[PDB]
């Protein structure tokens, strides 16, 4: 998904009790809140 | 023999039997050039350290390779001079940085640093490793002080010899 | 402002940081290692220590 | 730690690095692309490019 469609047409949320596993996806902008920024940008759509 | 090559510095070449190429450097350096003998894909033949003064201090590294062990190096390049020449701005960028500086000569100035060897007589030492800056100190006009190294098998192995006079 | 996120490698591992993209390597690699040790004390990796002389 | 000297070769081209002995290869295989190309485009010679689909 992060490669054929962009991050201004589908985005992405994990919901995890394992966020270790999930600790690649910080990198994808699909995953970047527009709405709350922080230090690294956009905020990172995974909640526990 | 001269070449210019993609490169970076102009380098000349000598050949006989076989090429031969120097670089001068300009208090001790490492001794450590014995892992340069076995590039990434070359393989020379000897690392000679020479050195030659008083007064007209001069230290050299002279250099051989034989092509006919390196045939499977010089098939991959567009020339076996630009192999070595490659191969001695290899080792003349890694000597370079320090206090002491490092360029290939060119062969006008090989043929200069031929007759400044020359200017117009003792045992070779078995064991060396302490003596050099003490076999500097005999009284002569010139003095002419030089160590070679070899790959007698993969380790390399060390011999020195002099000339007074 | 904008700010790399960047993934610094260090004895094996690879941290993640924020660093300012306009200001010099030498200003912001002063706080840099200490957040790298921190973190390696926090996976419990012996800290990055330097020996004889450099930067 | 540990690292390599080695050579690289690529796009008619042969260039010497260090490389981060114990480190996954897929840890620095971008990197690397990005440097060959980097010293290809200063070299003046056609960068590297993906054909397609591959790796």
Known sequence: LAFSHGPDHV?????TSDPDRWDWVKWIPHFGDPRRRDAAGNARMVYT | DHQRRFGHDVVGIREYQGQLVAVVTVWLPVEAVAARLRQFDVRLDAIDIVSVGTDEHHTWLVLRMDPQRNVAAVAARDSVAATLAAATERLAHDLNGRRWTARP?????????????????????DITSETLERLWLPDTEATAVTVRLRPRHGGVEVSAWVRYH | ?????????????????????????????????????????????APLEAKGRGR
């Open chain 1, 11 to 15: 985005q992405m949320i994990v919901v």
């Open chain 2, 105 to 125: 000569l060119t062969s006008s100035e090989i043929d200069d640093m031929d007759a400044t060897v020359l200017a117009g007589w003792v045992s070779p030492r």
């Open chain 3, 1 to 45: 402002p904008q700010a790399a996120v960047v993934a610094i490698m260090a004895a094996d591992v690879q941290i993640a940081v924020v660093l300012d993209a306009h200001a010099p390597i030498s200003v912001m690699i002063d706080p840099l290692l200490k957040v790298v040790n921190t973190r390696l004390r926090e996976l419990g990796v």
